[PDB]
Amino acid sequence: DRPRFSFSIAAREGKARTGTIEMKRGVIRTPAFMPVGTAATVKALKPETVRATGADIILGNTYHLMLRPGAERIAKLGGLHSFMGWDRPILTDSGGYQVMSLSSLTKQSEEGVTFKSHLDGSRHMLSPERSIEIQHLLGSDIVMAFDECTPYPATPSRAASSMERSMRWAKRSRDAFDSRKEQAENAALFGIQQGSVFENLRQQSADALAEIGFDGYAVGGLAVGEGQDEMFRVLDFSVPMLPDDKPHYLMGDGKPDDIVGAVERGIDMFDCVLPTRSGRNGQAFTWDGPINIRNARFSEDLKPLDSECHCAVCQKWSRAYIHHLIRAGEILGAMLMTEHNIAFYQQLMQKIRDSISEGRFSQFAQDFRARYFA
Amino acid sequence: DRPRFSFSIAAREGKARTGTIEMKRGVIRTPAFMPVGTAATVKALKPETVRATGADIILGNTYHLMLRPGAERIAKLGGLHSFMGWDRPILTDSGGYQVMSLSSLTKQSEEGVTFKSHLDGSRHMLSPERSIEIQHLLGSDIVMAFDECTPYPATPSRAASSMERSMRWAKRSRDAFDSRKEQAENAALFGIQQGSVFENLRQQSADALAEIGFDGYAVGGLAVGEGQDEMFRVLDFSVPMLPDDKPHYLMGDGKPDDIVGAVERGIDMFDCVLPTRSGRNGQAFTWDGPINIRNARFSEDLKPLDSECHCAVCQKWSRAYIHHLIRAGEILGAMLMTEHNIAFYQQLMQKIRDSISEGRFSQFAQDFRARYFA
Ligand SMILES: [Zn+2]
Ligand SMILES: [Zn+2]
Numbered sequence: 207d208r209p210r211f212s213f214s215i216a217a218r219e220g221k222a223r224t225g226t227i228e229m230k231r232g233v234i235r236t237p238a239f240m241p242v243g244t245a246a247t248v249k250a251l252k253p254e255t256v257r258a259t260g261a262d263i264i265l266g267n268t269y270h271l272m273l274r275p276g277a278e279r280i281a282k283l284g285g286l287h288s289f290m291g292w293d294r295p296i297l298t299d300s301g302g303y304q305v306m307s308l309s310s311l312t313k314q315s316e317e318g319v320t321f322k323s324h325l326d327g328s329r330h331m332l333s334p335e336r337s338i339e340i341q342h343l344l345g346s347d348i349v350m351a352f353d354e355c356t357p358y359p360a361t362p363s364r365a366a367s368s369m370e371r372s373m374r375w376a377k378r379s380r381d382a383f384d385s386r387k388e389q390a391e392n393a394a395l396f397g398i399q400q401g402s403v404f405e406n407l408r409q410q411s412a413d414a415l416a417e418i419g420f421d422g423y424a425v426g427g428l429a430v431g432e433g434q435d436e437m438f439r440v441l442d443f444s445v446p447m448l449p450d451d452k453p454h455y456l457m458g459d460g461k462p463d464d465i466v467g468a469v470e471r472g473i474d475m476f477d478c479v480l481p482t483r484s485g486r487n488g489q490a491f492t493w494d495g496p497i498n499i500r501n502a503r504f505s506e507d508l509k510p511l512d513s514e515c516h517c518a519v520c521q522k523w524s525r526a527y528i529h530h531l532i533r534a535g536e537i538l539g540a541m542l543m544t545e546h547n548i549a550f551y552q553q554l555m556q557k558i559r560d561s562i563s564e565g566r567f568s569q570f571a572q573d574f575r576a577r578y579f580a
Numbered sequence: 581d582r583p584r585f586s587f588s589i590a591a592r593e594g595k596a597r598t599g600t601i602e603m604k605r606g607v608i609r610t611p612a613f614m615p616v617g618t619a620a621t622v623k624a625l626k627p628e629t630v631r632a633t634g635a636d637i638i639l640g641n642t643y644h645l646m647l648r649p650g651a652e653r654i655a656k657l658g659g660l661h662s663f664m665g666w667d668r669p670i671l672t673d674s675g676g677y678q679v680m681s682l683s684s685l686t687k688q689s690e691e692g693v694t695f696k697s698h699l700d701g702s703r704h705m706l707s708p709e710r711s712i713e714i715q716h717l718l719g720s721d722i723v724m725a726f727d728e729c730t731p732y733p734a735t736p737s738r739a740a741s742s743m744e745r746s747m748r749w750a751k752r753s754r755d756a757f758d759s760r761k762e763q764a765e766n767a768a769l770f771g772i773q774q775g776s777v778f779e780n781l782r783q784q785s786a787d788a789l790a791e792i793g794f795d796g797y798a799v800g801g802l803a804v805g806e807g808q809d810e811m812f813r814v815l816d817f818s819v820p821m822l823p824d825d826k827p828h829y830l831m832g833d834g835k836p837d838d839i840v841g842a843v844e845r846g847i848d849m850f851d852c853v854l855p856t857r858s859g860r861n862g863q864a865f866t867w868d869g870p871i872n873i874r875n876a877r878f879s880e881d882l883k884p885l886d887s888e889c890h891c892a893v894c895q896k897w898s899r900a901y902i903h904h905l906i907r908a909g910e911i912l913g914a915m916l917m918t919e920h921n922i923a924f925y926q927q928l929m930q931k932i933r934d935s936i937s938e939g940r941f942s943q944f945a946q947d948f949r950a951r952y953f954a
Contacts (some may be wrong), residue, residue, distance in 0.1 A: 246901070250915070252915070275879070283898070291897055300629060524657070533650055534619050538623075
């Protein structure tokens with residue numbers, strides 16, 4: 207019934223857009239938050255719970271999956287969707303970022319990268335061709351081109367070199383994806399803009415990616431230490447360089463205010479790990495800003511994590527109980543914190559979508575920030 | 581509507597019985613498996629999931645709760661049921677066993693015991709009066725008398741001394757419970773038979789407890805190293821000493837075959853920790869015996885944990901997936917293993933209840949053992 211891929215914009219306000227991506231496995235409402243699944247699980251949540259929070263799509267980490275349980279093994283078992291029990295779209299990253307951040311003994315070349323697993327020191331390889339193949343074996347719906355990441359800060363020369371290599375690799379990724387009929391006909395492929403903080407390099411990258419042609423365009427290389435002011439400054443000039451009629455995906459971690467500002471700058475998709483990572487460490491998001499539930503001030507607080515949140519956690523349990531669970535190291539604490547935090551991010555996305563649709567997003571952003579930072 | 585406490589026996593076969601305990605917060609089907617909640621949580625499960633597995637009642641560990649978050653704190657917050665979100669009956673243990681097993685610097689006397697917390701070395705006290713008070717503060721439905729445990733093996737003299745002290749403490753527990761109107765009118769009190777492996781001491785203990793009078797009678801002091809043959813030998817003579825018309829509660833850990841044999845000997849209630857403890861360590865129960873899901877033989881096994889199990893885990897996920905989760909140390913692995921194992925124990929209890937009701941329990945026990953140990 208549904209097409210391989212169709213992005214439609216229903217409403218706009220300034221640079222912000224709201225709409226839908228239709229794919230074979232489901233519809234994705236945009237702007238979208240895509241919860242992160244590492245090794246075939248969204249931390250401490252059954253897939254049905256992830257869906258109940260409002261997620262339309264989740265991310266799978268290729269690097270983690272190729273190490274454990276293995277890409278070929280997942281294919282033999284019927285693919286990632288079947289394996290983990292999530293039947294809606296899955297976006298897979300290329301594996302490259304985690305190779306840089308997590309792996310050891312990395313050897314980089316124009317062909318790709320060889321590296322040692324951080325788990326057992328076994329040797330592995332990634333390349334544009336192999337990354338696209340692994341994403342095929344997983345049965346990914348949205349496949350990411352394999353690129354070479356640029357650390358922050360980067361000199362103009364190094365940023366240019368890595369961007370140029372990334373563009374050559376974007377073409378190789380495109381060709382690998384297209385040559386595999388089943389993948390080409392059923393999945394989508396996104397390209398990744400590079401260029402660090404440099405406007406000229408960002409423009410060259412956008413031009414190269416548009417010439418190749420992709421179903422969507424990510425902004426890569428941000429959220430890696432430059433800070434919000436600089437990230438926003440780069441997004442100001444970078445997002446307008448990308449094709450307007452395709453989704454714009456900001457890759458990287460983000461707080462609620464990062465998401466709001468990025469949407470104001472034309473971003474349609476987010477993959478923030480913060481709500482799945484920081485939940486078990488005690489951080490809970492609320493409309494009045496984040497709290498750390500471990501703080502002693504919550505030990506006898508009968509209110510829910512957030513006073514307005516519609517999630518199941520906030521309907522049933524108190525701050526006092528969750529404080530106890532997290533302090534005690536109980537698994538249920540991680541379950542409840544993670545469900546609430548992902549649900550909070552999804553409610554943020556719903557408010558963003560509704561406000562853009564109603565032409566009051568700028569007001570929403572101002573009201574959101576005033577209260578969140580009060 | 582329902583009474584404070586009413587135990588009714590609907591059917592019998594040999595020493596085995598099936599029936600119901602009616603209490604204000606709900607009906608408990610017997611023979612019953614009562615999943616263990618330590619510090620106000622059944623490991624890795626929301627209360628609704630615990631209920632979905634078939635549990636009618638759960639256990640709360642008094643020792644753990646008095647340390648964290650504290651009994652007075654739980655009372656201030658509205659009681660244990662409200663705190664953790666379980667609205668059905670809760671049985672609380674007295675705290676005594678864990679004082680012996682887990683605490684340090686224990687000082688025992690005829691008055692009670694003082695001890696240091698294993699968490700932070702803070703000093704605490706338990707006595708018949710204080711244990712009953714803590715169970716009141718938690719809002720327990722079934723309160724356990726506070727006793728003095730007897731290690732295995734025990735000399736006849738030491739077993740007699742501890743049994744005699746336990747009987748004096750049973751009277752003190754009875755009086756403390758009765759003097760508190762709200763507790764006496766709404767909760768039930770069980771006494772605990774002691775006497776180690778000695779028939780004469782078990783008889784003296786049963787006589788003392790029956791003279792005092794309780795709503796139910798536990799068999800204490802077993803499942804502590806004597807092994808199944810000896811446990812069954814002691815149950816053979818010990819259970820018939822207890823009043824026939826009240827529930828018989830075996831305190832201690834147990835495998836599926838321990839439960840079946842104990843029911844054959846007249847036990848009505850079980851509190852086995854094994855399914856909540858061993859799940860995250862890899863052990864899954866099946867009708868063909870236990871398996872360890874971490875074993876490499878399961879890495880590509882698409883079958884559910886058990887071929888007949890009706891639990892949600894066995895409807896949705898494969899052995900291969902759960903193998904991966906447990907090997908990877910993922911929280912979802914513990915969630916799924918624990919849900920399946922508790923559900924397996926509940927299905928065992930349902931088959932036991934149905935077979936007794938139908939006068940075919942002896943056949944069920946034989947068939948169960950033949951297959952479980954094949
Ligand atoms: Zn919530
Ligand atoms: Zn099952």
